[PDB]
Design a binder for this molecule. Sequence first.
Ligand SMILES: *[C@@](C)(CO)[C@](*)(O)[C@H](CC(C)C)NC(=O)[C@H](Cc1ccccc1)NC(=O)[C@H](CC(C)C)NC(=O)[C@H](CCc1ccccc1)NC(=O)CN1CCOCC1
Ligand SMILES: [Mg+2]
Lengths: 233, 240, 211, 222, 231, 244, 235, 250
Amino acid sequence: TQQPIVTGTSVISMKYDNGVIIAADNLGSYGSLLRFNGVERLIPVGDNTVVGISGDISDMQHIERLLKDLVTENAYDNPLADAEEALEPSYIFEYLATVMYQRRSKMNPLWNAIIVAGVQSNGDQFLRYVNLLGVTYSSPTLATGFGAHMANPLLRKVVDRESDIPKTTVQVAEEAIVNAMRVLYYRDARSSRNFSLAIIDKNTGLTFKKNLQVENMKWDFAKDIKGYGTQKI
Amino acid sequence: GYDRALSIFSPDGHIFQVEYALEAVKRGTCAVGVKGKNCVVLGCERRSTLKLQDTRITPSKVSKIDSHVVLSFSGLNADSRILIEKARVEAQSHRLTLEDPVTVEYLTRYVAGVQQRYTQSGGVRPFGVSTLIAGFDPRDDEPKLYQTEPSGIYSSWSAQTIGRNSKTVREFLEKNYDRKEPPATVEECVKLTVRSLLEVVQTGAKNIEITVVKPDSDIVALSSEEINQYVTQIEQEKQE
Amino acid sequence: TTTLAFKFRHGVIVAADSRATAGAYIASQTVKKVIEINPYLLGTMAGGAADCSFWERLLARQCRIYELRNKERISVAAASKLLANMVYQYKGMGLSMGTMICGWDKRGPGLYYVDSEGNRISGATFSVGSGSVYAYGVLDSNYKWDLSVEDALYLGKRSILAAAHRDAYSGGSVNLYHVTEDGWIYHGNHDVGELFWKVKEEEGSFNNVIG
Amino acid sequence: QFNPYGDNGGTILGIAGEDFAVLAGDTRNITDYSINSRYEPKVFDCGDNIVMSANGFAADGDALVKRFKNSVKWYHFDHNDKKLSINSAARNIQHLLYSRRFFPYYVYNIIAGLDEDGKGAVYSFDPVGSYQREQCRAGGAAASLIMPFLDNQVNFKNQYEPGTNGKVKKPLKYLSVEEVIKLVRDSFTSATERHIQVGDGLEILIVTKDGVRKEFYELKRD
Amino acid sequence: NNYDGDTVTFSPTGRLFQVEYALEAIKQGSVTVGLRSNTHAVLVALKRNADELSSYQKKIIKCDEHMGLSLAGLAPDARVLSNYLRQQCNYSSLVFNRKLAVERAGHLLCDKAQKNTQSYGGRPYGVGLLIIGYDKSGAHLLEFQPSGNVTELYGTAIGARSQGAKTYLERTLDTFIKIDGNPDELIKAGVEAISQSLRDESLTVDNLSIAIVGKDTPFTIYDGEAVAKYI
Amino acid sequence: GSRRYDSRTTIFSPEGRLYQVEYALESISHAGTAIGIMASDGIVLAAERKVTSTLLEQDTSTEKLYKLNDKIAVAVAGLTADAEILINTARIHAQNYLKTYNEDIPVEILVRRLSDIKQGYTQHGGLRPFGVSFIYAGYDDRYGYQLYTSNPSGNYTGWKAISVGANTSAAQTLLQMDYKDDMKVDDAIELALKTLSKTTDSSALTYDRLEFATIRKGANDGEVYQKIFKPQEIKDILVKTGIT
Amino acid sequence: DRGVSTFSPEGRLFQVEYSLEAIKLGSTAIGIATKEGVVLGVEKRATSPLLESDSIEKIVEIDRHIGCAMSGLTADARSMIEHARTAAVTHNLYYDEDINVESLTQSVCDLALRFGELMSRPFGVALLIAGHDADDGYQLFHAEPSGTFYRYNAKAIGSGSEGAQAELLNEWHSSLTLKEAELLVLKILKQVMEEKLDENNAQLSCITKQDGFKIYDNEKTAELIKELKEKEAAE
Amino acid sequence: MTDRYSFSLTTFSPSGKLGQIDYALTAVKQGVTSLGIKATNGVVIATEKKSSSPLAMSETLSKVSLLTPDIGAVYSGMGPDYRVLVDKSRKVAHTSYKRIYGEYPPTKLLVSEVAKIMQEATQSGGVRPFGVSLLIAGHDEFNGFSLYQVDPSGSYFPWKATAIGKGSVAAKTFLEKRWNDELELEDAIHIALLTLKESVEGEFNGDTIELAIIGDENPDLLGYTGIPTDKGPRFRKLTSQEINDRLEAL
Ligand SMILES: *[C@@](C)(CO)[C@](*)(O)[C@H](CC(C)C)NC(=O)[C@H](Cc1ccccc1)NC(=O)[C@H](CC(C)C)NC(=O)[C@H](CCc1ccccc1)NC(=O)CN1CCOCC1
Ligand SMILES: [Mg+2]
């Protein structure tokens, strides 16, 4: 049993017709202190999977090392390591989910919430969640922390059920994700303007975008707001 | 730990260490067991090479395992103490867990199991001991007499002997003991047990020990004079 | 729960209700609180359903290996003691069991109370469970040794009914057993709903209730 | 302080027929007042004509199912591809549950299938392995809403025959699969109205001698 | 001679005699054949009986839905190694949700057998195994020797008189590899291959044992009247 | 591996004897003779030191007679180093008993414990046995004065008079001849020294080649006193009995 | 000396082969499987007339549906029987059912090769394991110290085994009744035994679906012996 | 790996001999001569510094070792075996005595502990006996001065004076003629130097001889003042110069 020290906030994601999108901001908070501004919380595994992590950053860095070692180990005595016997999103997820549940069962958890996003061999979209309790679930949209409360409602307006996935393009899906990240910046006190975004498409592969910023913000209406009720000046 | 396999098979299918343990039993002093109609008698040889002995304190050949069961033996004396201690512990453990004293058959099965375990365990040699276990089951008036040996096999006997010159006394018992009509009284049972030892013992003085076990935990060891009276009567009838 | 058992001339009667509870919610009403360990041994269950079920099923397996090694059916005293020693290892760890080991052996009919606290008691009359206190009134007032099998079965049945009526956590149906030297005999499942009205009319009891 | 348990909601329901059995459960997964998934399967075909659903704390339910599926696999290996009977599975599951008597699987569990006489069977388990064969059983969040309805509409409790006035009961006539599925849908539609953790979807698994069939029905998404 | 008392001793020419003696136990064992195409992989085994009253010792063991083997030599050692494969296949499924690659299964068997050849007290395994399977890279056939050596092959045979079947497969190589989408014809080629190792005795209904795995075919074993079709 | 170099210390011979026990007894037969004699009013322990030197410090020396507790003593025959290992164990056992039951350990119980330890080395462990034979002289309120012996086999027996070490055959015959049941300590002292004087391999029996001890109720009223004789006291008793 | 787990140049384990020689010295045990049941019979072979023969226990119950006969170093069988009984009852605990005869036999045979430098040597005893289950019906197995087990229609182990097996070769057919099998075991035992066969030095037993495993009384066997003598004198 | 030699390497032969102990004693016989003499007011122990090479600095190799402030040791036989025994002897004096009773052990009990260690190497699994005989000189309040010999078997004997190693038989004879119960420490040192000269071939001086005494308390060697009851170590190693001074009056 511990407590989280340096933390990462929401990770958000959704499926679209040809793949998945996942995003997360670049902040490592230390309680109310916005300590570390250059933290990457999206971690690619091969060219077909991206693991997005929230929660304790020291535990994130540990998981990041487990994944790096997983790739190394899969290549051992494996001539098809860059082909048929490459790591799949479903393999990577089940491994993490196994570790998370084992750690909670020893009362010494990895204080994280994880979303594994990727595309399988057969072109199927993979998107599944796992957390410190070993709890797992899948949905067309997934989000951790505050994103679960604010992002999911917005993303579910695009993909409300399974049948809406083929009707959703990459331009529409990215637009929705970017908007959700803006909303979280308005409303989450432990968020940052700077974020990273990753797209895993079955045709165009893995596209990893860094140093993105929340833009097109609305603040001008603030000038007209005066006092808390009766004040006029 | 010392894990060496000492008891192993030989090309002809023999475990020599177990068979050599039987040779240690052959060397040991003679022990005999005879069950009557309402009793069991255990006779034991004492070799008279050792005089100046203190008979008060010297370890007796017949050992009580519980109040209703006794155990005599032939072979290595030091080895017998280990089996007796284990048997005594098990007897109390049985009373403690099952709220009944052990049956004679159960106690025998335990002791025999210990002997067997030492024939296929690493780093240990077999017990150079054969035992005669006798007594009466709780709330039962049927006499019980069992034998064990180093290999671990056990069986029930109407009458049996073990140790040196046991071949001779077994020969005597086979022709003298009648199954249809066993020794009806304690006297007849003790007399037959003393007679059998007199075939082998040498002198009938302090060389013969007798222990009578009767039902309901009634166990007593005869004295030198009491036994000497049997020795006297036997030979006086023989002079004819 | 309500369970009871008592020794008498013609063996031992065993009776129990069938209710299972999770707070105020009645989760089940078809629970068998009497476990058949062997054709001559019964066990009752009270408290932790899971605990009672597991340990008494594990005991039945101990009692069976006993019969194989010894060529002899285990005694009621030995069986009760194996259970007692098993649960004593986990004392203070949270187990909740209130059991009675009923049977017929060499010493005649036997009846032992065993619990997770550590008690192991031989006795002619027992009742354990939340409704035991109500059942004891009927038992103590009508219990003889010279009781007919018919009257003894009724007494155990009527005793559970008394408890099932008053105790909120007791009811459903009554399971009856009679243990003889030729083994135990199941005497049916009796719905308390129907049984109550029947007894009320035939006996005249429960005058305060309208029907 | 770290709490190793959670509540993922959900409700399940098993009904045994004369020559069939059904195991139903909603597809909603939740934490507190949030929805995790509107379609997250909870009832599984475990092999040998057995269906199972364990939930409450999803992570413990997933592990138990995963272990029992594994137990079936090894039962075949060790006993010459013998079919695991429903009564044998039930007893096996008890021992999986009690192995953690001092750190329990926080779940409600129900299995369903056919007994060795071909008749429908439903077994119910508490978190630590107390199990019971029953004709009708609901488990989970809205179990208390559904069970009284099933006592009335499956076992005809408190129902008597008109004219007699309480003297003669309603006779226990068996139910068909079509009649049972109606009770299942009505049970879950009623539970969806009054319980916030129940909704989104309803997945039913029907078990016959022919095998295991699925049916899916939508529920309210509020 | 002086260097065959245990597994921990090289001979002066660099040989390990206890391993070679374990290899000898395989040659005494009954014949078994393995072969594959691009779609399917087949095991064929000649079972052996003690006498006419006895049953015919089973030769084929299932490891997973997509993998299994046939044995030749000490049957208990095959039970130990197959149990290990069952666990490893199972670990891969439970932890990684991944069917174990046949090549990796061979690497694990090699490493398990090797430990028994370098340490004091233990002994080498006295059995040879033919592993077949269908994974993400198609059909596979492996040959396991208790020296530790594992080899991927198109076809092979082990046991007594196995050289006859191995020569046949070496001729038929170009034909049976092309038998795609036709399980019965691939088994026929296997039954015809194992027939080259028979003397005096012939293939009867309770003598023959066949197993197959493929693209849309789980590992299944055929015995009794199920193989009368191929006699 | 290691099997090649294992002597296998705990095995039977074809005749049913324990090789190492028999060879340990052979070792003990070359050790200095130790004699124990039990009388009605006490026990005597006499023992011969092995070929000493004039430069050996005798008054601070101890190779034969050791104290286990206030009531029990032992005479040693064999490897002294092996004996000290066992003696310290016996001292601890005696104290454990006293702590547990608040009574002095009965003699036989102490003897049985040591003999069981010896037995263990003959049946398991693969180690050589202790090359030691003890004569236990002790007193308790059950059996009174007691003499026991134990040997590497772990077998023990009770005696009225007994010898261990060298020339036991000759020594036992001499003891069997002159011993009587109504004998007293002063007479037993004389018998022990006379027996050593006749069985010794040395030219003459002197004070510097002996260790001597008595266990007497010759302590003021109902109690027991152990007396380990000093060099000068051994010299005096040799003159008194008429040996020097 | 040499390792306990050593292979011979022929590819056999020395110790396993030597234990088989010990089994050849053991008393005879015979098993015959029919569609009406499986019969088990043994030679008691008392070493002396004073030995109470009814204490010789070479036929043993494992469960209600499984019996067992032994031959060789019989003391070694006790821990095997103990394991078998535990395995049978443990499976009933975990699965609420009877255990398959083959599965029970496999569990016993798993102990066999657990020896090295675990126990110090192989078992010096062979077992005939007979039983019934719902899947494969009446079955007879021969469990060796090699870890191998064969199923048999009929089998003889012990000193008179090869002579008895040849006799079982000719006599066994798939339509044998239980009564016919009983007489057949008695016939072959009488043939290979040194001493004259009677109810005191030989013992019969059977396993049926209805009544389960039963050891025959000496009075019951005596009648079957008398019935055998008369039918042999009939031609 | 694992130490698989769990069995005894020293065993009784048919004649009753413990071979490895006898062979260990033979190694002691080949070793350089060392001796010890007990006086009324002290004890002396001495040996030859047999230098393996003239390039080797023989001052760095100490054959005579301090075990406690009042107990010293010297050996004959295998040097490395002695060095480890000294390390163990020093430690056991603390662990099995000083940390319990708050004072250093008396000579006889420290000897008893060293003996035990050597006995165990004679019975325990997978080890050979120590190939050394020790001479341990010491003083304690209640026993006074004392000198003990310890053999490979673990047996120990107290001596008025003795010698071990190469020329022990001749040296013990020499000591028997010269020893009496009225010797002062200086007389014992003189006799020690005379006895040791007979067994030495080459150079005989302070640089080739190692000699130490157990005598009076040395407050100058204590290293601190302020506690009256602490009066300093009785063990003292004689310097090269101090030996040479006594070789002129030889
Ligand atoms: C009378 C009826 C009541 O006193 C009897 O004593 C019966 C005995 C029969 C059932 C053998 N006892 C009960 O009904 C017993 C009461 C009880 C409850 C909890 C602990 C001890 C005693 N009830 C149970 O055992 C129920 C049986 C279920 C409903 C089938 N089990 C539970 O309540 C389980 C077991 C809990 C548990 C025990 C030990 C460690 C961990 C957990 N608990 C749950 O299902 C969780 N519960 C569900 C309802 O909501 C609250 C949480
Ligand atoms: Mg118990």
